[PDB]
Write a protein that binds this ligand. Structure first.
Ligand SMILES: *[C@@H]1O[C@H](CO)[C@@H](O[C@@H]2O[C@H](CO)[C@@H](O)[C@H](O)[C@H]2NC(C)=O)[C@H](O)[C@H]1NC(C)=O
Ligand SMILES: *[C@@H]1O[C@H](CO)[C@@H](O[C@@H]2O[C@H](CO)[C@@H](O)[C@H](O)[C@H]2NC(C)=O)[C@H](O)[C@H]1NC(C)=O
Ligand SMILES: *[C@@H]1O[C@H](CO)[C@@H](O)[C@H](O)[C@H]1NC(C)=O
Ligand SMILES: *[C@@H]1O[C@H](CO)[C@@H](O)[C@H](O)[C@H]1NC(C)=O
Ligand SMILES: *[C@@H]1O[C@H](CO)[C@@H](O)[C@H](O)[C@H]1NC(C)=O
Ligand SMILES: [Cl-]
Ligand SMILES: [Zn+2]
Length: 612
């Protein structure tokens, strides 16, 4: 649109390109700021006006992106990839990829419409009770808490089913259309489908195989945490609802998607009657503010000689579900406005331990932003999406330790023994191990939708194939191809790639090891706490300050000593409980896995009318 943001004109030289990029950066910062700020208004407030606006701002960006896009390749496309300066050719290579901008005007508009709509359908969805046409439940908070702490099978079933129908069914038709378009766009950028484009970010001709191999190494870990919990669950709901030889029913693991079981710790905790490793109740006791949480998280960050939250962040962030009745996308996220000034976090935070680490997780994104803000805009990325999701989790590892919790107030004791040690490790196992299958599975499903191996005619049938197959969980009520359970997961509607969370969970420990070593810690990897270690923090920040300038595979070597992802440091972390669980299941005759696939639990007695 605006002429001042249009390209200009340059030499089909590498010296021309150095200039081309220098320019793009100054202009792009504007066009990106606007589009980002527009969204920030829509997410922090969902109105038809803001959506319209957003959809507009997107059109400009798509406009901008095309101009420099087709220009950068107008004359820099038979030669880049042979440029001396790696950073330069990695920038030009980021610009030559138009993305959605390659789509005719009508189609961009359809595109942008789908996006703001799906995210709207996803965050507006509600679950209403049968007869009481009285006030509905919302994914956050109502639904989450019910899955996090309600032990009523029927009740959980009502919310699990409620949410999955409510969010999925309407989303399906739009998803199929978004996919057709998304592909069409990147098809022109040279990739087969968006799937291939998404994986090209790791630069590894071997990515998928490295991941499949990496999973086998860990599968045994999951299968054991699984049979152990499946047993604990049988113990509580009985023999009618839990099959000791079948997949677990998806709504009993204490989380809507069964992606992390840390909320059922009190039902599987091996050695109970000991100090409780869930500050979640001491946080309330002390009167923890939602802000108080973003301060403790910050404090850790500062001690490692890393920068604190800027004032803009404190003035412009939304750290609580507002009260003006405004409707917001409650999912926690971190925002980079590409203006080296504005960095904020959007999260309907309330006072919970699992929420205290999500705060750290998010700060990790902000800290990554603050660190690389001084690089060409097109390089303000993590080494790879994985590194980004890792950053806050790493520091989280040190925070979760019982020794650290005490140092800061919520673990009233200190019981240095095995039993407590096992409990801790199991708790962490419920959070990190239980997730591995899911994290893998999601983009497994998607790469196949984008490629056509999973047409809308098999959206749900291929989703539960993957879910049963990897998580060993099954749907509590029957399902069919009018359903779209994959769509009930925030990340599918809001088009976010997922294979990054897997990478993240595996290489967050490589970091944890590497950092604990420079901190000068010795003792066990799972009891390490890099707190106040300016030496450790300096090691981390070198990776941060690199953005997408250098290949992750190099930025990783410098920091960890390895050319790639490794589960070894992860196995070393959970070692004790790894052997413990394994020994426990055997004695108790458990069966690792689900041989009775195809098994489904029956409905509550009169469905669906009871104490919800
Ligand atoms: C990309 O362009 C932005 C915008 O000019 C650059 O950021 C500025 O940095 C200078 C100092 O180097 C400050 O005086 C400005 O206030 C910053 N923003 C503005 C408004 O210009 C950034 O350095 C450029 N990146 C590269 C590598 O060229
Ligand atoms: C998919 O399975 C669901 C669950 O059984 C089906 O929905 C029920 O079907 C009856 C009629 O057979 C309706 O009265 C209900 O309203 C439906 N849902 C509920 C809340 O029970 C659905 O028909 C199935 N879809 C297909 C095409 O087989
Ligand atoms: C919510 O969005 C509306 C219109 O998009 C806007 O007028 C209002 O200011 C926003 N809510 C606020 C500010 O509390
Ligand atoms: C998105 O929602 C708006 C508002 O109802 C509607 O006008 C538009 O057609 C929707 N887009 C799609 C493709 O669903
Ligand atoms: C309490 O929460 C409010 C609302 O976010 C915030 O303004 C205030 O700084 C918080 N106080 C503390 C000490 O956390
Ligand atoms: Cl990714
Ligand atoms: Zn994240």
């Amino acid at each position: 649109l605006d002429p001042g943001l249009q390209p200009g004109n340059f030499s089909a030289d590498e010296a021309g390109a150095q200039l081309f990029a220098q320019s793009y950066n100054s202009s792009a910062e504007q066009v990106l700021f606007q589009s980002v700020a527009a969204s920030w208004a829509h997410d922090t407030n969902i109105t038809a006006e803001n959506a319209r606006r957003q959809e507009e701002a997107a059109l400009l960006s798509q406009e901008f992106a095309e101009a420099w896009g087709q220009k950068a390749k107008e004359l820099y496309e038979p030669i880049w990839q042979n440029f001396t300066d790696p950073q330069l050719r990695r920038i030009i290579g980021a610009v030559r990829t138009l993305g959605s901008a390659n789509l005719p005007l009508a189609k961009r508009q359809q595109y942008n419409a789908l996006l703001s709509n799906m995210s709207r359908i996803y965050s507006t969805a509600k679950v209403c009770l049968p007869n009481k046409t009285a006030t509905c439940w919302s994914l956050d908070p109502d639904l989450t808490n019910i899955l996090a702490s309600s032990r009523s099978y029927a009740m959980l079933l009502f919310a699990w089913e409620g949410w999955h129908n409510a969010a999925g069914i309407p989303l399906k038709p739009l998803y199929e259309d978004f996919t057709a378009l998304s592909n069409e766009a990147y098809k022109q950028d040279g990739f087969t489908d968006t799937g291939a484009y998404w994986r090209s970010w790791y630069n590894s001709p071997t990515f998928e195989d490295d991941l499949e191999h990496l999973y086998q190494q860990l599968e045994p870990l999951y299968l054991n945490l699984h049979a152990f919990v499946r047993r604990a669950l049988h113990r509580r709901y009985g023999d009618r609802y839990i099959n000791l030889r079948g997949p677990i029913p998806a709504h009993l693991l204490g989380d809507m998607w069964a992606q992390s079981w840390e909320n059922i710790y009190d039902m599987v905790v091996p050695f109970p009657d000991k100090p409780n490793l869930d500050v979640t109740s001491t946080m309330l006791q002390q009167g923890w503010n939602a802000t108080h949480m973003f301060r403790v998280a910050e404090e850790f960050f500062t001690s490692l000689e890393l920068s604190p939250m800027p004032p803009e962040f404190w003035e412009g962030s939304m750290l609580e579900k507002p009260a003006d009745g405004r409707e917001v996308v409650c999912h926690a996220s971190a925002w980079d406005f590409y203006n080296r000034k504005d960095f904020r976090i959007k999260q309907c935070t309330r006072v919970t331990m699992d929420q205290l680490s999500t705060v750290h997780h998010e700060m990790g994104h902000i800290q990554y932003y603050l660190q690389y803000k001084d690089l060409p805009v097109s390089l303000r990325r993590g080494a790879n999406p994985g590194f980004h999701e890792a950053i806050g989790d790493v520091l989280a590892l040190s925070v979760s330790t019982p020794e650290h919790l005490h140092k800061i107030g919520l673990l009233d004791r200190v019981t240095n023994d095995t039993e407590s040690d096992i409990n801790y490790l199991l708790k962490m196992a419920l959070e990190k191990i239980a997730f591995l299958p899911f994290g893998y599975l999601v983009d497994q499903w998607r790469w196949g939708v984008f490629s056509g191996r999973t047409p809308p005619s098999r959206y749900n049938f291929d989703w539960w194939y993957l879910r049963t197959k990897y998580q060993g969980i099954c749907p509590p009520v029957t399902r069919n191809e009018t359903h779209f359970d994959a769509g009930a997961k925030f990340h599918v509607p809001n088009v976010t790639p997922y294979i990054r969370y897997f990478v993240s969970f595996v290489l967050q420990f490589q970091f944890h090891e590497a950092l604990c070593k420079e901190a000068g810690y010795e003792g066990p990897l799972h009891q390490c706490d890099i707190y106040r270690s300016t030496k450790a923090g300096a090691k981390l920040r070198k990776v941060l300050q690199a953005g997408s300038s250098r290949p992750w595979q190099e930025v990783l070597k410098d920091m960890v000593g390895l050319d790639a992802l490794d589960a070894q440091p992860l196995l070393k972390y959970f070692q004790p409980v790894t052997q413990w669980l394994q020994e426990q299941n055997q004695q108790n005759g458990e069966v690792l896995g689900w041989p009775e696939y195809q098994w489904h639990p029956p409905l509550p007695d009169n469905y669906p009318e009871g104490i919800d």
